[PDB]
Design a protein around this ligand. Sequence first.
Ligand SMILES: c1ccc([C@H]2CCNC[C@@H]2OCc2ccc3ccccc3c2)cc1
Ligand SMILES: *[C@@H]1O[C@H](CO)[C@@H](O)[C@H](O)[C@H]1NC(C)=O
Length: 332
Amino acid sequence: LTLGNTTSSVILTNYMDTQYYGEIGIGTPPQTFKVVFDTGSSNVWVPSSKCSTACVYHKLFDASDSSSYKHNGTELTLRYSTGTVSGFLSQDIITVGGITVTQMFGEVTEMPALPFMLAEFDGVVGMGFIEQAIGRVTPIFDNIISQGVLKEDVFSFYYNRDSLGGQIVLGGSDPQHYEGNFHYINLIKTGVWQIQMKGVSVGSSTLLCEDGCLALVDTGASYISGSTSSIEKLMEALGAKKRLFDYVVKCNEGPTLPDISFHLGGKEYTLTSADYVFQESYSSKKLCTLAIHAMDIPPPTGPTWALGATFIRKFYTEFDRRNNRIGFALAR
Ligand SMILES: c1ccc([C@H]2CCNC[C@@H]2OCc2ccc3ccccc3c2)cc1
Ligand SMILES: *[C@@H]1O[C@H](CO)[C@@H](O)[C@H](O)[C@H]1NC(C)=O
């Protein structure tokens, strides 16, 4: 007998405002993994004991220590703008919070040092739709919905500033982590956590996305990202400069930087300089990083902006599967 009355919370660790990860258990007895809960991907994967560079520094799933394991073996490749992993399919029981689900997942045998050496987590729990799942593997949240345990077919994200690192709620939202009410925006289409964006303002003027654009709400992305063209105009308006990997401003100029507003649904979602500048110094002789970068996301998802951790820290986000919508409320 299953009742639709469960809301399960998962505590997240915040690593340097760029990586938010929690724990999942795989197998019998459970093998624990640190995972990023990512709305921009639809597959579950962890490094495998069968792995070979980055595998030496992470926890590895050993199917031979699990009584609940079911062999599959189908080859799996997950390719993204952030990185590419490869491996094979396996089935086992996955526990997330208090929910236990039989899940088809990827045992990763190919983990490149770039960017996986920089990862403090072991794997990724894809929070996206089946439409974007590689190998048409049923995503974890669809398997949780099938169970009929959830109070609501929603999941929410709280990302704290770098003390609770963050929290994911399965089956609802935590009113202790937001203020006021949620404002909802319907998805353009089911299959992707993406909504229409009406404009991007720098200061009081609509400088970008003037004829509208797309916004992927991506929990696994560290930063806000835009296309090369959009980011070039944004960075020139901020007076930011491209160093080796990131855009920087002179630390003394950081607090004076203009507000950046994203016009979504019938509301402006504003990030002040404090929300997007890693203000590690106030010195005129030091360089301060911006939590914004360019990413040319390929079709079908892109060209699109991606609202990552930079955005989520400011706005508590609810991903609603029953109504195909995303809700935002000011985080606390
Ligand atoms: C495998 C690779 C990349 C991703 C993307 C898919 C779109 N959303 C962002 C995710 O990146 C998560 C991620 C992956 C590697 C990382 C390595 C270092 C730091 C952060 C990292 C974050 C999912 C699975
Ligand atoms: C692996 O699982 C998929 C279901 O997602 C199935 O279609 C496929 O035939 C399985 N392969 C093996 C070898 O069991």
